[PDB]
RNA sequence: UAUCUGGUUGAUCCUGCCAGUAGUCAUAUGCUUGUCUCAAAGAUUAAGCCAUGCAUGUCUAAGUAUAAGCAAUUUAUACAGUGAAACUGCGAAUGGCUCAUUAAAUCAGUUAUCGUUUAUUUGAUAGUUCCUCUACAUGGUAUAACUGUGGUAAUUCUAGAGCUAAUACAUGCUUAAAAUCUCGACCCUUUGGAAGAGAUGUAUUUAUUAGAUAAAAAAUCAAUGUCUUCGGACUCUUUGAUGAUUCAUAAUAACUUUUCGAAUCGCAUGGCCUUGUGCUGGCGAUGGUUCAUUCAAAUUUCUGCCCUAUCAACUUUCGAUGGUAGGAUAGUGGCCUACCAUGGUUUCAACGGGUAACGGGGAAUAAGGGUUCGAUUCCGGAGAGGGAGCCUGAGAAACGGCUACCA
RNA sequence: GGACUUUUACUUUGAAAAAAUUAGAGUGUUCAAAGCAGGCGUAUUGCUCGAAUAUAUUAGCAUGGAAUAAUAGAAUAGGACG
RNA sequence: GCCCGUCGCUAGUACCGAUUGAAUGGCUUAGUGAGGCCUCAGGAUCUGCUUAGAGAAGGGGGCAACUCCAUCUCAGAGCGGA
């Protein structure tokens, strides 16, 4: 196409947004960044579709040149910045901190948390591997490299990192019956043990999940995110805890919650 | 490059276009109903023939069926709200027995002469158009 | 296709960087590069015993095994170092709720380890361009006629 | 109103394709190349015009040119051009040396100067004091992550 | 310009196949170096995303290792002696990969001797102490030795010099020497 | 949402069409036309031609103001507010338009990069630069705008003369301590031993080397290793990723018209005491090499296209299939070349022809099965009158870029 | 306890799967085509459910099955197992 | 009664057909061959090092005596670069 594209028309963009249909012709289009444009949520949407602060798009940057917001610690004032999964974004000036969670139909939840905790997240290590100069470093996924790490941790692992000084702080392996998110496929905003991890040499492990109901599940290897022991997570989970229910008891819950 | 604002056509004509026994069949319910044309009584002969074909479908599944369970008994609940179907010929069987008028008779047009307001239906009409 | 003298080609024939010092006197005159394919391939005797160069084949040379792996069955060896697989199939046409035998002809690179022939059938590996129409590479041989 | 090319030969106009930084062409876009018509360098009957360019005066003086002088707009700006105009020192502060030039509003007389650029300010040897300073900064903090991982893979068989 | 592009060809099946679009440059090729023994002219060319390449266009002395001693010495290129490619690259000497040239001997001479400190073919205290250690391992290869009688050594090119603008290559030893031998008695 | 009816006879029952009937995101046209919402629209024929206007420009506290700009008069006699023009930087490769080409091509699902390029965003990354008397309290030139002397009927044409800036251009200092290496003065002969001299950042090019590991015991040669009971001794000794590698990474000998390692900017103006405009010092911007990330790109595996045999053999013309080497490319590859073989496709329809053919998502038609359509809102592709070629750039074979032929 | 089909077809279940469109749940756009909204209260500095689900009929990948249909194998034993 | 063909009038359609018929498009033998691009040269103009001598500086440390880094003015003469 003679070079990089810089438009997004308002269908291909990604639906968990939740855009509208109509409104205009086009969607923000996140930015280069730390996480996958597909797989991103940009800060206009947060601030103005999920967070109703504001009205305009020209009431975001409105905002976001005011430092009003920061993401993973730092000041962001790019509108169209590509926050994702396990990121905190931190208002200051109403003292109220979030993390993107996923759902469990596999939106972004408004999950809002404390300020203990925000100052920490998690973050799957995609590649551990040995740069220039004999030093080693790890890469997680959020495309944060934090060299010289414990020569424990292997590739799938996540990894406390802090957040205002990066540094690794505890971590948990990938093995049988740890607790885990599922960050895309199908299964998108579920949470579960796990069980067993199918090893298919050439290409696509897959990996069976279990939850606290009994629902015993597949995905590939990359869509799982493990975060902590069994029972045990390692951070504050949305509510319903990631368990998908099926609509006839989605039903329920609603109409049955109506009524006193 | 926008988006569709989708739409649909509401109705469709029958086939063979010149029935006698349909004709005064017809012409009968625009009468009693206070219909001014042909096409409100299609529009509602398509309604009908929809929820007969997704009746028909349902039921071609065994029961217990998440889906014909689910989607069933959604219709039926929806049926009732507005009185097309009894309130107790709750059964998809009975969904398929509903007939022209039962829907016809839930018509803001036949209800503002139902209960009093009117005492007629062509008079029910020009009362509602006439805010 | 045969199996040379190694030198009969106008260039001298060696592995890269696999280097043999004269000041160093040696039981084997030549030191043999090999490799293990993967897939649980198991590289034979002839790849690491033989004199052959081959920048071509899956063991001893420098290129890799990966993406699909196929079964075909051996239909022309009349070409050098490489031969041609045939793979069969039947395509479903949902009109005639039925089937059609088609096929494709897919050429592969032998190494000189195997000594396979027509009948032959053949297990092979993708392992990038290799040549204009070359894509796989022979990496495993099932038995003949007899 | 052909402008002669430095170089050409020929009495002739011809057509060059010229490029960035050559006469008789002012790109209008980077990587412009323009087929452009340009006159020989020999001379001929066909100028309008010759540019000629005084270099040894004659013996009478000639009235339009050699008697009168015209100013050179501008002054020196930056710091050690100011020096090499005046013939000055390293340590020779420039400053108080610089051209100004006075303008009139209606009656209230004000005066402007260049900002000397180059100059030496306190504030740029902080710069390089900072950046010295970082380098080294970060220099030892490597080397302290650095031998203390050696020493958490030590006990990595020890333990 | 040229191209690189597999679509001009013929398919396998022996089809012409419609022109499908026109060239990109992504697919582009380039004219050679052909470079030639010379005063050290080398231009160089902007290649994709940035990066740059190197026209070795004249070339003399290039950077040279004798592998089997360990060292690298800056050499000279007499000429070319043989080419498997084509014989055309000798006859202009022309210089490319696996070129098989000759090379100054006396700057590994040079080394030899203040290395194993024998005198090749025809004082001090710690110098005497090193050499009798170096010594028994101070004997070279036969084929190897006689070469700089004349003074000039068999290499074989092993850089890319219309690439990186470098003529390296390691002086022929072994068996592979053997070979080339064998075939500059069936040509020169 | 599973229906038929009219027409061959004198009458009959069949075969069989013709005609009727119903819909069409199906176009045109006729007649009629009041209201609400909704809103397609020069595709078809001519990827035919185009008057005129508009459609791509861009400045923060933070690269360059002596405008003979303006406003004030700043505390400002270096600058200091605002600021045309100009330099610099970035963008103009997105968007929008069209469907001409294209029939194994595109395209769709599914793969591949252990086969490459990647502006940017985000995260990491630099004590080594001179040298057996040096600028670093900071090197040097030139240019624009501008001024003035001009040419042409004519344009976003420009000459020659004179000024002057940089995050433009071109130069160019620097920083601890240890260690290991070769060189070896010399002395003193033995189990000998060393002064002190160099070298050692990164990147480039080549070669060599490590990068071990399924389960163990000895004999030695070549060269030098901690030692100790001066006899001879040597243990707990080190190493990552992948299904798979000459992988990541490190080491050695050198190589280089030598890559990078801040001669930049904005806010702050506090702290040590020897009081020098000494020393130190914060927040941030813009730069920078390498790696990672990201937005991408380029090739790429498997399967799948309409009519056609009044197309049966096709491919190597002048590469057709493969081998070896090279060149070339960002890299794989007959991509190109040299040399060598005679291979490659086909009735399971090759090759050739046709298409009033861009592919797909999808659309019309409601028993089912099917039938027909898709220029056109989304994705992919191609093209910018026809062809070819290239400049710039991270990205174009770009056309509101250039160059040539053709029209 | 982990891999395991002589080699296939077939069939079951999943995974990797864009939106819109289609099927279809919820929602009183005043109805409707639509849209993805909205709903509650002290309505003077608030509360609150959502934006599901099905889809896909080839090929590839993963998996439960072995009836049906192919196929391989010891005969001059150059047979199997240890 | 039905009914076949020549021959006869009118109109329409396609076929055959001298014209070494015509047009448009793709591919193409032979000959010719723009252009930018790469290359051997060229060198209007420019210019980086170097060298003996020459006119005017300041002392690496001096009883006379010696000798460095920079900056720059005209006769020259060696090697390169844009
Ligand atoms: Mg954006
Ligand atoms: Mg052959
Ligand atoms: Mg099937
Ligand atoms: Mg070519
Ligand atoms: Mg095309
Ligand atoms: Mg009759
Ligand atoms: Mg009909
Ligand atoms: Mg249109
Ligand atoms: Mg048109
Ligand atoms: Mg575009
Ligand atoms: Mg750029
Ligand atoms: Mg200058
Ligand atoms: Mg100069
Ligand atoms: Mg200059
Ligand atoms: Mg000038
Ligand atoms: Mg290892
Ligand atoms: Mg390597
Ligand atoms: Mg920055
Ligand atoms: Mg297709
Ligand atoms: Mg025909
Ligand atoms: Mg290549
Ligand atoms: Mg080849
Ligand atoms: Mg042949
Ligand atoms: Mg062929
Ligand atoms: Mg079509
Ligand atoms: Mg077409
Ligand atoms: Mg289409
Ligand atoms: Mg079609
Ligand atoms: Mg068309
Ligand atoms: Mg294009
Ligand atoms: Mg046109
Ligand atoms: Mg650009
Ligand atoms: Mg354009
Ligand atoms: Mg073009
Ligand atoms: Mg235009
Ligand atoms: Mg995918
Ligand atoms: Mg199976
Ligand atoms: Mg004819």
């Not at chain 1, 971590?171 to 067993?196: E, M, P, S």
């Not at chain 5, 690298?72 to 210089?95: C, D, F, M, Q, W």
């Amino acid at each position: 196409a003679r070079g990089p594209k810089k438009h997004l028309k308002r269908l291909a963009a990604p639906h968990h947004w939740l855009l509208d249909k109509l409104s205009g012709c086009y969607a923000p289009r996140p930015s280069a960044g730390p996480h996958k444009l597909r797989e991103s949520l940009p800060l206009i949407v947060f601030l103005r579709n999920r967070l109703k602060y504001a009205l305009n798009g020209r009431e975001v940057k409105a905002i976001l040149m005011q430092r009003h917001v920061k993401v993973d610690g730092k000041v962001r004032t790019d509108t169209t910045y590509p926050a994702g999964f396990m990121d905190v974004i931190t208002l200051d000036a109403t003292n109220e901190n979030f993390r993107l969670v996923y759902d469990v139909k596999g939106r972004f939840a408004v999950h809002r948390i404390t300020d203990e905790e925000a100052s920490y997240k998690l973050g799957k290590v995609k590649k551990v591997q040995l740069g220039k100069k004999g030093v080693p470093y790890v890469v997680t996924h959020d495309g944060r490299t934090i060299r010289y790490p414990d020569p424990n941790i292997k590739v799938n692992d996540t990894v406390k990192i802090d957040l205002a000084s990066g540094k690794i702080t505890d971590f948990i392996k990938f093995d049988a019956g740890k607790l885990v998110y599922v960050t895309g496929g199908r299964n998108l905003g579920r949470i579960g043990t796990i069980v067993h991890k199918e090893r298919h040499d050439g290409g696509f492990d897959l990996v069976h999940i279990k939850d606290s109901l009994d629902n015993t599940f597949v995905t590939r290897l990359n869509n799982v995110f493990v975060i902590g022991e069994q029972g045990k997570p390692y951070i504050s989970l949305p509510k319903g805890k990631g368990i998908k229910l099926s609509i006839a008891e989605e039903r329920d819950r609603r109409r049955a919650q109506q009524g006193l | 490059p926008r988006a569709p604002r989708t739409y649909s056509k509401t109705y469709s004509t029958p086939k063979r276009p010149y029935e006698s026994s349909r004709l005064d069949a017809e012409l009968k319910l625009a009468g009693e109903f206070g219909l001014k044309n042909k096409k409100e009584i299609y529009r509602i002969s398509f309604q009908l023939s929809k929820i007969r074909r997704a009746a028909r479908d349902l039921l071609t599944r065994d029961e217990k069926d998440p889906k014909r369970l689910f989607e069933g008994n959604a219709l039926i609940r929806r049926l009732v709200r507005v009185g097309v179907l009894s309130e107790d010929k709750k059964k998809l069987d009975y969904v398929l027995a509903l007939k022209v008028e039962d829907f016809l008779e839930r018509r803001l047009q036949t209800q503002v002469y139902k209960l009093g307001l009117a005492k007629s239906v062509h008079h029910a009409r020009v009362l509602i158009t006439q805010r | 296709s045969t199996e040379l003298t190694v030198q009969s080609e106008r260039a001298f024939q060696k592995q890269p960087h696999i280097f043999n010092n004269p000041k160093v006197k040696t039981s084997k005159r030549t030191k043999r590069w090999y490799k293990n394919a993967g897939l649980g391939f198991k590289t034979p005797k002839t790849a690491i015993e033989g004199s052959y160069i081959d920048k071509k084949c899956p063991f001893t040379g420098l290129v890799s095994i990966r993406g699909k792996i196929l079964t075909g069955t051996v239909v022309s060896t009349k070409m050098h170092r490489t031969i041609v697989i045939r793979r069969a199939y039947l395509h479903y046409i949902p009109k005639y709720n039925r089937y059609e035998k088609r096929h494709k002809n897919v050429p592969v690179h032998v190494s000189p380890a195997f000594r396979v022939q027509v009948g032959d059938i053949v297990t092979v590996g993708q392992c990038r361009p290799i040549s204009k129409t070359v894509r796989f590479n022979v990496v495993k041989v099932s038995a003949a006629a007899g | 109103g052909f402008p002669m090319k430095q170089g050409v030969l020929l009495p002739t106009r011809i057509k060059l394709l010229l490029t960035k930084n050559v006469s008789c062409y002012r790109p209008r876009r980077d990587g412009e190349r323009k087929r452009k018509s340009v006159r020989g360098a020999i001379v001929g009957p066909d100028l309008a015009v010759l540019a000629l360019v005084i270099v040894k005066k004659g013996e009478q003086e000639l009235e339009g040119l050699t008697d009168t002088t015209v100013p050179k707009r501008l002054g020196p700006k930056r710091a050690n051009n100011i020096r090499k105009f005046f013939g000055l020192s390293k340590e020779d502060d420039v400053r108080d040396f610089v051209i100004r030039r006075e303008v009139t509003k209606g009656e209230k007389t004000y005066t402007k100067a260049p900002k000397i650029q180059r100059l030496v300010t306190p504030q740029r040897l902080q710069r390089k004091r900072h950046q010295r300073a970082l380098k080294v900064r970060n220099a030892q903090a490597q080397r302290e992550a650095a031998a203390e991982y050696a020493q958490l893979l030590a006990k990595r068989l020890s333990e | 310009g040229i191209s690189r592009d597999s679509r001009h060809k013929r398919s396998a099946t022996g089809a012409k196949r419609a022109q499908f679009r026109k060239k990109r440059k992504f697919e582009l090729g380039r004219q050679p170096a052909n470079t030639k023994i010379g005063a050290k002219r080398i231009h160089s060319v902007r290649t994709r995303g940035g990066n740059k390449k190197y026209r070795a266009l004249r070339i003399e002395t290039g950077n040279f290792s004798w592998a089997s001693e360990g060292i690298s010495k800056k050499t000279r290129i007499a000429g070319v002696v043989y080419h498997p490619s084509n014989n055309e690259l000798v006859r202009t000497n022309t210089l490319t990969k696996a070129a098989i040239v000759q090379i100054d001997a006396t700057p590994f001479r040079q080394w030899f001797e203040a290395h194993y400190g024998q005198t090749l073919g025809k004082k001090s205290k710690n110098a005497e102490r090193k050499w009798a250690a170096r010594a028994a391992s101070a004997k070279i290869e036969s084929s190897v030795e006689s070469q700089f009688s004349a003074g000039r050594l068999y290499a074989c090119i092993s850089s890319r010099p219309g690439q990186s603008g470098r003529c390296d290559g390691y002086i022929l030893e072994g068996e592979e020497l053997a070979f080339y031998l064998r075939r500059l008695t069936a040509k020169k």
